Design a protein around this motif. Structure first.
Motif, PDB file in Angstrom:
ATOM      1  N   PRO A  15       0.681  -1.018   0.251  1.00  0.00           N
ATOM      2  CA  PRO A  15       0.021   0.105   0.079  1.00  0.00           C
ATOM      3  C   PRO A  15       0.755   1.220  -0.209  1.00  0.00           C
ATOM      4  CG  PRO A  15      -1.140  -1.858   2.071  1.00  0.00           C
ATOM      5  CD  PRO A  15       0.519  -2.087   1.206  1.00  0.00           C
ATOM      6  N   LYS A  16       0.676   2.378  -0.653  1.00  0.00           N
ATOM      7  CA  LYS A  16       0.589   3.670  -0.300  1.00  0.00           C
ATOM      8  C   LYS A  16      -0.048   4.486   0.154  1.00  0.00           C
ATOM      9  CE  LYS A  16       2.182   1.549  -5.739  1.00  0.00           C
ATOM     10  NZ  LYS A  16       3.428   2.103  -5.464  1.00  0.00           N
ATOM     11  N   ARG A  17       0.886   6.102   0.389  1.00  0.00           N
ATOM     12  CA  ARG A  17       0.404   6.934   0.983  1.00  0.00           C
ATOM     13  C   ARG A  17       1.179   8.240   0.837  1.00  0.00           C
ATOM     14  NH1 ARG A  17       0.436   6.013   8.251  1.00  0.00           N
ATOM     15  NH2 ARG A  17       2.843   5.870   7.906  1.00  0.00           N
ATOM     16  N   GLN A  18       1.184   9.786   1.031  1.00  0.00           N
ATOM     17  CA  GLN A  18       1.211  10.306   0.641  1.00  0.00           C
ATOM     18  C   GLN A  18       1.258  11.256   2.399  1.00  0.00           C
ATOM     19  OE1 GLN A  18       1.220   9.182  -2.040  1.00  0.00           O
ATOM     20  NE2 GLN A  18       2.574  10.903  -2.488  1.00  0.00           N
ATOM     21  N   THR A  19       2.718  11.347   2.892  1.00  0.00           N
ATOM     22  CA  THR A  19       2.573  11.726   4.463  1.00  0.00           C
ATOM     23  C   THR A  19       3.597  13.321   4.885  1.00  0.00           C
ATOM     24  OG1 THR A  19       4.333  10.548   5.789  1.00  0.00           O
ATOM     25  CG2 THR A  19       2.165  10.067   5.379  1.00  0.00           C
ATOM     26  N   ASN A  20       3.306  14.044   5.456  1.00  0.00           N
ATOM     27  CA  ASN A  20       4.106  15.251   5.401  1.00  0.00           C
ATOM     28  C   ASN A  20       5.511  14.631   5.971  1.00  0.00           C
ATOM     29  OD1 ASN A  20       2.347  15.061   8.158  1.00  0.00           O
ATOM     30  ND2 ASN A  20       3.875  16.902   8.744  1.00  0.00           N
ATOM     31  N   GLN A  21       5.236  13.755   6.945  1.00  0.00           N
ATOM     32  CA  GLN A  21       7.217  13.352   7.395  1.00  0.00           C
ATOM     33  C   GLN A  21       7.540  12.729   5.731  1.00  0.00           C
ATOM     34  OE1 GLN A  21       7.032  10.908  10.619  1.00  0.00           O
ATOM     35  NE2 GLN A  21       6.912  12.572  11.810  1.00  0.00           N
ATOM     36  N   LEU A  22       6.986  11.657   4.992  1.00  0.00           N
ATOM     37  CA  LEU A  22       7.916  11.405   3.695  1.00  0.00           C
ATOM     38  C   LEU A  22       8.375  12.646   2.519  1.00  0.00           C
ATOM     39  CD1 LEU A  22       5.711   8.647   3.691  1.00  0.00           C
ATOM     40  CD2 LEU A  22       8.177   8.185   3.349  1.00  0.00           C
ATOM     41  N   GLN A  23       6.977  13.558   2.724  1.00  0.00           N
ATOM     42  CA  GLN A  23       7.211  14.420   2.080  1.00  0.00           C
ATOM     43  C   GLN A  23       8.565  15.324   2.420  1.00  0.00           C
ATOM     44  OE1 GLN A  23       3.826  16.351   1.816  1.00  0.00           O
ATOM     45  NE2 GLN A  23       2.058  15.098  -0.240  1.00  0.00           N
ATOM     46  N   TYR A  24       8.951  15.842   3.778  1.00  0.00           N
ATOM     47  CA  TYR A  24      10.117  16.964   3.592  1.00  0.00           C
ATOM     48  C   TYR A  24      10.879  15.319   3.896  1.00  0.00           C
ATOM     49  CZ  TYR A  24      12.803  18.392   8.472  1.00  0.00           C
ATOM     50  OH  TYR A  24      13.971  18.792   8.522  1.00  0.00           O
ATOM     51  N   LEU A  25      11.561  14.283   3.807  1.00  0.00           N
ATOM     52  CA  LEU A  25      12.159  13.249   3.662  1.00  0.00           C
ATOM     53  C   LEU A  25      12.782  13.255   1.704  1.00  0.00           C
ATOM     54  CD1 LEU A  25      11.174  10.823   6.118  1.00  0.00           C
ATOM     55  CD2 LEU A  25      13.946  12.058   5.789  1.00  0.00           C
ATOM     56  N   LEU A  26      11.834  13.636   1.460  1.00  0.00           N
ATOM     57  CA  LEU A  26      12.604  13.842  -0.262  1.00  0.00           C
ATOM     58  C   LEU A  26      12.764  15.423   0.035  1.00  0.00           C
ATOM     59  CD1 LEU A  26      13.244  13.230  -2.993  1.00  0.00           C
ATOM     60  CD2 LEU A  26      10.198  13.248  -3.256  1.00  0.00           C
TER      61      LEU A  26
END
Ligand SMILES: COC(=O)c1cc2c(cc1CS(C)(=O)=O)-c1cn(C)c(=O)c3[nH]cc(c13)CN2c1ncc(F)cc1F
Length: 126
Positions: A15-26
């Motif tokens: 499964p996939k999700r967009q999070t503010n933490q994953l966005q910050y990491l990239l």
């Protein structure tokens, strides 16, 4: 003797999700570490053939690099930010395991790790 294939970077069965933490990491962590003056040895898998390091993959069984991390982030391969943080940690520890302490490559990894930790201490909530 040949290089191993690079780490897996896309898995359509997870499964996939967009999070503010994953966005910050990239957008913040990966982007800022990529542009650091000492990033160049860590942007792609270690090419043991081109670098004439025949024992690299005899010692390092869990290779990791920032190019693979960037692809994993782009492909929504991580569900949790800690999976990504462990990949950065695997990259640094592989350098510390393979190379002699005080070697220039180790000093470069230590500087990237210091910057990485500064960015992780500012990870956004949830
Ligand atoms: C074109 O770039 C290079 O020549 C290159 C040199 C280089 C490494 C990686 C690359 C990138 S790659 C795609 O060829 O693997 C490199 C990377 N890592 C993570 C290591 O643990 C190494 N131990 C010895 C070397 C490396 C040789 N060396 C190196 N050795 C000492 C240093 F201080 C800095 C270094 F980059």
């Amino acid at each position: 003797n040949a290089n191993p294939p690079p780490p897996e970077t896309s898995n359509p069965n997870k499964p996939k999700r967009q999070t503010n933490q994953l966005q910050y990491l990239l957008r913040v962590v990966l982007k800022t570490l990529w542009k650091h003056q000492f990033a160049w040895p860590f942007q792609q898998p270690v090419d043991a053939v081109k670098l004439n390091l025949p024992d690299y993959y005899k010692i390092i069984k869990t290779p990791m690099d920032m190019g693979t991390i960037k692809k994993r982030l782009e492909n929504n391969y991580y569900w949790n930010a800690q999976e990504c943080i462990q990949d950065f940690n695997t990259m640094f520890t592989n350098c510390y395991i393979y190379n002699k302490p005080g070697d220039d490559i180790v000093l470069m990894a230590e500087a990237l790790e210091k910057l990485f930790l500064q960015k992780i201490n500012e990870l956004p909530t949830e």
